[PDB]
Each structure stands twice: as structure tokens, then as C-alpha cells.
Amino acid sequence: APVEVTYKNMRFLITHNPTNATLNKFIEELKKYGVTTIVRVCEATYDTTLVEKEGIHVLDWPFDDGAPPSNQIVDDWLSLVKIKFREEPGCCIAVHSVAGLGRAPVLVALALIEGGMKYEDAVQFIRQKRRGAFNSKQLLYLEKYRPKM
Amino acid sequence: APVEVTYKNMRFLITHNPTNATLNKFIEELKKYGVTTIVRVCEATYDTTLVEKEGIHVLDWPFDDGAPPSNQIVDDWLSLVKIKFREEPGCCIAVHSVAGLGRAPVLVALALIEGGMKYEDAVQFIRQKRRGAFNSKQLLYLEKYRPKM
Amino acid sequence: APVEVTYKNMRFLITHNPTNATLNKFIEELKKYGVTTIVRVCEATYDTTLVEKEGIHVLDWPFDDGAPPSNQIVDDWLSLVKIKFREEPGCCIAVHSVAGLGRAPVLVALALIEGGMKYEDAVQFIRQKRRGAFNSKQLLYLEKYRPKM
Numbered sequence A, B, C: 001a002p003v004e005v006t007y008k009n010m011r012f013l014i015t016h017n018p019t020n021a022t023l024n025k026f027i028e029e030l031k032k033y034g035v036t037t038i039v040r041v042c043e044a045t046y047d048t049t050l051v052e053k054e055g056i057h058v059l060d061w062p063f064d065d066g067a068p069p070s071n072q073i074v075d076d077w078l079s080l081v082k083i084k085f086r087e088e089p090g091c092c093i094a095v096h097s098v099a100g101l102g103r104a105p106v107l108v109a110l111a112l113i114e115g116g117m118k119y120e121d122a123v124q125f126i127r128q129k130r131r132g133a134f135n136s137k138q139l140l141y142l143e144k145y146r147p148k149m
Helices: A023-032 A048-053 A071-087 A103-114 A119-127 A136-144 B023-033 B049-053 B071-087 B103-114 B119-127 B136-144 C023-032 C048-053 C071-087 C103-114 C119-127 C136-144
Strands: A003-006 A011-015 A035-040 A057-060 A092-096 B003-006 B011-015 B035-040 B057-060 B092-096 C003-006 C011-015 C035-040 C057-060 C092-096
Touching: A003 C119, A011 A023, A011 A103, A023 A035, A023 A048, A035 A071, A048 A057, A071 A092, A071 A103, A092 A103, A103 A119, A103 A136, A119 A136, A119 B003, B011 B023, B011 B103, B023 B035, B023 B049, B023 B092, B035 B071, B049 B057, B071 B092, B071 B103, B092 B103, B103 B119, B103 B136, B119 B136, B119 C003, C011 C103, C023 C035, C023 C048, C035 C071, C048 C057, C071 C092, C071 C103, C092 C103, C103 C119, C103 C136, C119 C136
Parallel strands: A011 A092, A035 A057, A035 A092, B011 B092, B035 B057, B035 B092, C011 C092, C035 C057, C035 C092
Antiparallel strands: A003 A011, B003 B011, C003 C011
16 A cells, blocks of 8 residues: 655655554565655554664654644654755655555645645645545645745 | 546546446545546446435536547536636546547546647656557647647 | 656656567557557567567667666667657657666666756656666766766
8 A cells, every 4th residue: 555756856655554563564665665764753553663673764753633743843854855865866755644644645745845836736746646645624734834945 | 447647736537437337336436536526528328316416516528439529518628627626626527438548538638738738748648547548530639739728 | 567657758668578478468568558669678588570570660779787878879769769759749669678677767767867857856757666776886877977968
């Protein structure tokens, strides 16, 4: 069920929630897509040190389901996006939440928007890859979000 | 097996011609892709009343196999496209013919062109999603087509 | 499964080595993908004549596995590309290598770069369709490439 989104020097892998009892299969896939680091945006359900073990870096920035990400998180997220793909050309950043339909897709959307896409373009571009990518509240949030390249 | 095409605020779903026996599953799939309105461009082989009842709206704009759509159809189709994606950002409009290689992709192409894409680009864009998407007559039609809006 | 890449009026099909001696099905799919020409970049069993007999033009431009293609090859490649897609809009150029992870995607990459994409862009675009499409050498080669302008 791995969802991949590209544009333009950016590449994202939106993924589901793993467990200690399924982390093996989950890492194998990450390694396959050239994932250098993964940003967990939801609640912890497995031990991240196991991932860090295999050479994949981890950043744990969880925020409430449905609710909008803090200013700090959006901030860090964008800093990470801006530098990683430049420092490491062709790499891939995996972001994952529980369902993979709200929180992760939103950070991916804010990245596309900062990259020059209109919000309605960023929403379709993503749903192109993940059927039910956003709920009403989240859509409204993306609609009122103001970028600064 | 449904083909999906998107750019930029637009997002289309080209489906096969369902049947009364598979309609229930056909409707669940549409709902999941976020389709609010479907456009049947071919000869009727199933009853749409059940689709209308499940909340999805049907537009019967059939036109001759191989022959180009009339000005009326082209006009209504482009009108629906411009409006629907405006009214419900992030939604999807389903289009379907019989084989899904001619009439259906032709309307999709026209939308993309008025969307700012050159015909050659639109032809390739759709073929990456639907292998043998056009015949010689349909290609010549799209080449001589003059973008209105 | 077949690795296909589109942009904008260009469309490339990266192929492996025609399985189980039955190049019959290999040719059937090429024709379905609207392939008119095939660029063989490796050197192996492949009844080149059987293919051309079926209607598909074959060009033999083999080069060192891992090493950068010569300037003549890039030259011919680039003209082949510009020519063919203008000549027959909507067609497809197949690129044939051994593993379809190096030599082939590099050429495809050079075409996208010529199309206006920056190398990071072209590297992400292709890996979107083919997981491990480039090795270190190849990535560094594309970083130093400079399109003839």
C-alpha cells in the first residue's frame, strides 16, 4: 500500500502505521524506495530505534488527529524538505501517520504548495495517488494556508 | 481497472461500461474515488436510476462511435468541467464509453487542452494511462481542435 | 509492471530482456504501447531482424555498463528523440538495457533534461516509476551534464 508523490526535486513516500510485529516488512519496503529518513507525525506504536538501527533516520513530530500541525512543526518540516533534497539529490522522505489519509498527506501538501503549486492543485495531485486523502476540516486548513516560498 | 488522469485542479476517472449485475460494486468504487457526477458518452446498456439514487449524478451525452462530439456536447462538457472543480475542489468527474479508448479519452483530452496543454502533450499524457487511447481519426480531430476558453 | 515515462510530448518505455525466448509477446506489447523505434543499449540475444520484420525500427547503440555513453551516442540519441516525436505525435520510443536500472534510464534522463528539467527533477521523475534507477557514478554523471544550448 505504498503511496509515492514526486515534484520536482522532491519525492515523498506516504505510508501506513507499522508495529513491532510488522516493522520488518515495513523497513524492507522503505529501503527499497531509497528512504533515508522517515518523519512519524502520529502517536508511537513501535520502537523507532529499530529503524535508526538500519541506517534510516527518524524524526518524531506527532500532532493530534484532525487538528492542524503547530507552527513549529510546519516550520521544521519545511526546513527539512528544503535542505534534504538539495544536500541529498534523488533521496526520498517517508512521512507516515496511522491511516495515511490526513496528517501525513497534509505535510506533503504544504510541501507541494511551497514548491509553487496552488492548494487545489496539491490536493488533486495527492488524491491522484491516495483515493480519500483529506477530510473537510483539513481541506479548509489547506485552503486558508498562506505560503512564503 | 480504472484509469485516472489529473492536471491541474482537474481530476478525471475513465471507467468501463458497467452492467446491472455489477452496478452495486461499480457505485462503491466511484464513491471511493470521490466522483459526484458521471458522464455516459455511449449507447445505454445499464440503468442509471440506481446510480442517481446513491447520490451520484448522471449526464447522458452519447455521440457516434468514432465520429467527433458535436459543438453542443463539447460545450456542455467544458462547462461542467470548469464549474464542478470550482464548486467542489478535490472532486473527480467520471467519464465512460464502451471500450474507453475513444470517445471518453477524447473529452478528457479536450479538457486538458483548454487547461493549457498542447494536443501532443494531452495525447501522451493520456496514453501513459490508457495504452491505445486514440485512433487516426480521433488524433486528427484533436490536432485541428482550436482551444476556446 | 512495464516502466513507462511521459513528459511532455515525449514518451519512453524502458524494457528488460525479452523473457522465455518468446519475443512474440515482447513485440505484441511494444505495438500496443505504440512503439515505432527501439534503442538497444546493451548487447544480447534478441532477434533484431524478427523485430524489424514486425514493423519496429531498431537502433544498436551499445555502451559500457556503468560508464557514461559517448558523445556520439548522446548526440544521436538527442536528435532521434527530437525527430521521432515531432514526426509521429503520440508515438513511443523503447529503450532496452539488461537490468533497466542504469544505461536505459540515463538516456531517458538526458531527454527530460533537454526537455527543460533540471537533473534532480529528472532523477526523481524516473525513480517514481523505477525504484533503484541510478547508481553513484550515473548520478554524478547527470549532475555534471550540461545540455547543449
